[PDB]
Structures are given as structure tokens and as C-alpha cells.
Amino acid sequence: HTLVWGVWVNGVDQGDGRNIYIRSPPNNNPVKNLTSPDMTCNVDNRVVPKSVPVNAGDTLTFEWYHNTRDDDIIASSHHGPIAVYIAPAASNGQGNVWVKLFEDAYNVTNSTWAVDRLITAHGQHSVVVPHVAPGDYLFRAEIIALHEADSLYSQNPIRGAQFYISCAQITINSSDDSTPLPAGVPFPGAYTDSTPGIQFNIYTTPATSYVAPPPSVWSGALGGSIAQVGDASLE
Numbered sequence: 001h002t003l004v005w006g007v008w009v010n011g012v013d014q015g016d017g018r019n020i021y022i023r024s025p026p027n028n029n030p031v032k033n034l035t036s037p038d039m040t041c042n043v044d045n046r047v048v049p050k051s052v053p054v055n056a057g058d059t060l061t062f063e064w065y066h067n068t069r070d071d072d073i074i075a076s077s078h079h080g081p082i083a084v085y086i087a088p089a090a091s092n093g094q095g096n097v098w099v100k101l102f103e104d105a106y107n108v109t110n111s112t113w114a115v116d117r118l119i120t121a122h123g124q125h126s127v128v129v130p131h132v133a134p135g136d137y138l139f140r141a142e143i144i145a146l147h148e149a150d151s152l153y154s155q156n157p158i159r160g161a162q163f164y165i166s167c168a169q170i171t172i173n174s175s176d177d178s179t180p181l182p183a184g185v186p187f188p189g190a191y192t193d194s195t196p197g198i199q200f201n202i203y204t205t206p207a208t209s210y211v212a213p214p215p216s217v218w219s220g221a222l223g224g225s226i227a228q229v230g231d232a233s234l235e
């Protein structure tokens with residue numbers, strides 16, 4: 001159970017984005033139905049009044065929280081991966097539009113899941129803004145909690161992989177468009193009951209064997225991190 005509070009751009013806090021530049025759902029409950037329209041941008045997908053200006057090459061940091069800013073972030077039980085996707089905003093997230101910019105699942109070096117490191121990072125994970133066409137975009141940050149993912153939601157709707165999905169409205173101003181955005185995958189649709197990484201038993205199956213759901217990270221993607229960029233306590 002987690003939500004996005006706002007974003008930072010090059011370590012500068014853009015301020016509380018909830019219902020402002022984040023298409024915030026009404027609460028932190030997960031999405032679990034893989035064929036739900038709610039898989040696009042969570043249960044209240046609509047245009048919000050602001051879009052955060054960035055340029056290609058900026059560091060864009062998403063900041064998550066549980067109940068209040070810079071708290072426990074997400075229950076520690078919620079082990080799983082983190083991904084970020086991008087789509088042109090005019091699509092409203094519909095159709096074959098989502099391109100993956102970031103994946104972090106289980107780090108064998110550190111023996112930690114992305115969610116574990118997100119807690120340590122005070123809810124902060126970042127991407128480099130890619131060199132796509134200037135314009136308005138949706139950045140879809142997705143945490144998958146796997147603690148009940150041994151079951152398919154379609155078999156037992158009390159369980160299943162849990163999707164904490166947050167769409168941020170980002171406007172890319174200065175970009176050379178050296179890597180034009182291609183078509184991508186649909187949400188709902190990209191993840192199905194047979195997709196690797198959706199049904200996974202963290203109690204019985206080693207995390208060293210976990211394969212995150214496709215698609216693969218796009219060749220145009222410039223990278224990211226799971227790390228505290230900004231100190232909310234200084235404000």
C-alpha cells in the first residue's frame with residue numbers, strides 16, 4: 001500500500017503533486033486484475049491540472065509514501081520489482097504506447113529486491129529523461145508487490161501480484177529527439193496470467209530465479225537508480 005507524493009527534477013523538489021500533476025487514485029490499495037482498465041494509470045485516470053517541466057537528460061525522481069510523507073514508504077512484506085514506462089500524453093495511456101525506461105527486480109550482488117531498496121531510499125527512485133520528441137508525456141511508475149503472487153488473481157481474487165501504479169504528467173521541453181519514442185505495449189494487456197514474473201512464490205522460489213515481466217527496457221533508455229536524491233526532512 002503506497003502512493004506517489006511528488007517528483008524531484010535534478011534534486012529540486014517540485015512539491016506535493018497529489019491530484020495536481022500526479023493522476024492520484026483515491027487511496028493506496030493495489031490494482032490486481034490484469035485485464036482491468038485500472039492497469040493503465042490506476043483507478044482514477046484523468047487529466048490533472050499541471051504537468052512538470054523537464055528537459056532530456058534531467059534526473060526525474062519519483063517519491064513514494066505509505067500514509068504520510070517520508071514514512072515507512074511501503075510495508076516491508078511487499079518485496080518485488082520496480083519499473084517505469086513512458087507514453088505520449090495524448091494517448092491517455094490507451095493502445096500500444098507504453099515504452100519501458102527502467103527495471104530493477106532482485107539484485108543478486110546486494111541480496112535485495114527493488115522495494116527493499118526503495119524503503120532505504122526514503123521512497124525515491126529516478127530515471128534519466130530520454131531524448132524523445134518535445135511534448136507532454138505520462139510517466140507510469142509501477143511497483144509489483146509479490147508477497148501473495150504464488151496465486152493468480154484470476155484463480156483467487158484475495159491474492160495475486162499487486163500493482164501500485166502512478167502516472168505523472170511530465171512535459172519534455174528541450175530535447176534533441178535523438179531517440180524517437182517507438183510504439184510500446186498496452187496496459188491493460190502486456191501482463192497476462194502466463195507472463196513471466198506475474199505468478200511467483202517468494203516463499204518457495206529463490207529470488208535469484210525471478211524474471212521480471214516483459215517488455216525489456218527500451219534501447220533508448222538512459223538509466224536510473226533507487227536512491228535518495230533529496231532530503232524531504234530539510235523542508
Ligand SMILES: OC[C@H]1O[C@@H](O[C@H]2[C@H](O)[C@@H](O)[C@H](O[C@H]3[C@H](O)[C@@H](O)[C@H](O)O[C@@H]3CO)O[C@@H]2CO)[C@H](O)[C@@H](O)[C@@H]1O
Nearest residue numbers: 001002027028029066067068074075076077078147148
Ligand atoms: O494479512 C494480509 C497482509 O497484510 C499486509 O498489510 C496490509 C493490510 O492487509 C491492509 O489492510 C493495510 O491497509 C491499510 C493501509 O496500509 C493504510 O495506509 C490505509 O490508510 O488503510 C488501509 C486499511 O484500510 O495495508 C497493509 C500494508 O501496509 C501485510 O503487509 C502482509 O504481510 C500481510 O500478508
Ligand SMILES: [Cl-]
Nearest residue numbers: 001075145162
Ligand atoms: Cl497488501
Ligand SMILES: [Cu+2]
Nearest residue numbers: 001002075078
Ligand atoms: Cu499493501
